[PDB]
């Protein structure tokens, strides 16, 4: 038999800035959002779900410098916590 499923579910998007706003990149160091995301994933994938990690990345941008940007979590339909369980 056939069954109904939600057309859109279990998504999470993470953008480098808020709408209307710029995102920064260094010619040799790369994109700050990308570098920050990797560092947080390396540190927190073992203990935090991806949504919590994304919030932590956001928090690291909280104090604005000369290159302020605020990464934004978008269109979330995760019904559960997504743990990476690195090593497993």
């Amino acid at each position: 038999a056939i069954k109904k499923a939600h057309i859109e579910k279990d998504f999470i998007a993470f953008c480098s800035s808020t709408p209307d706003n710029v995102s920064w990149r260094h010619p040799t160091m790369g994109s700050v959002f990308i570098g920050r995301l990797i560092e947080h994933m390396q540190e927190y994938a073992c203990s935090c779900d991806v949504e919590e990690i994304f919030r932590k990345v956001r928090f690291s941008f909280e104090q604005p410098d000369g290159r302020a940007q605020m990464p934004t979590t978008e269109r979330v339909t995760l019904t559960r916590c997504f743990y990476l369980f690195p090593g497993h």
Binding site: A5, H6, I7, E8, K9, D10, F11, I12, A13, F14, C15, S16, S17, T18, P19, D20, N21, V22, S23, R25, H26, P27, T28, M29, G30, S31, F33, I34, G35, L37, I38, M41, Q42, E43, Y44, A45, C46, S47, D49, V50, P64, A68, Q69, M70, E74, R75, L78, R80, C81, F82, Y83, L84, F85, P86, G87, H88
Partner: protein
Amino acid sequence: TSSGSEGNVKLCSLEEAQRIWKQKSAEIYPIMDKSSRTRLALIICNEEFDSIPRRTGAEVDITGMTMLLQNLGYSVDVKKNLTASDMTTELEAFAHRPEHKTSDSTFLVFMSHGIREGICGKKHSEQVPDILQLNAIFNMLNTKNCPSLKDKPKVIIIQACRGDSPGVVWFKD
């Protein structure tokens, strides 16, 4: 050690993995067995453009993200310097990959110039816009267009401007 497959990514111990499985009930996404699962990830990065400045430093992002997603257990496809049409075609091809059936999740990474409307393809200019909308990425990866990833976490990461504004306002302390 960083010599292993997980590299610089801190490992989750068996005790920590059971603690997480205990602290939260049936509210965690199921992980497939490591020996049989075929995790896939896609990175699209535009660095060389027809009309907009070169994204110097993009290689650092490509390297960083590729190694990270591999560390997390994903097979990483890297595609570079694509038009929005090429991005669409690559996304559709990715949604059709048989490995998603024996995968528990996916990561999609987009890195390019961007405007309010979306992500810039290699041919983008004000005269002739070459834009991929975020809405289109979702549509291409949803249950209708990618049934293999039904019930599975799909993580989309976008490095791009979303407009020209500095994202700041002044206040007096």
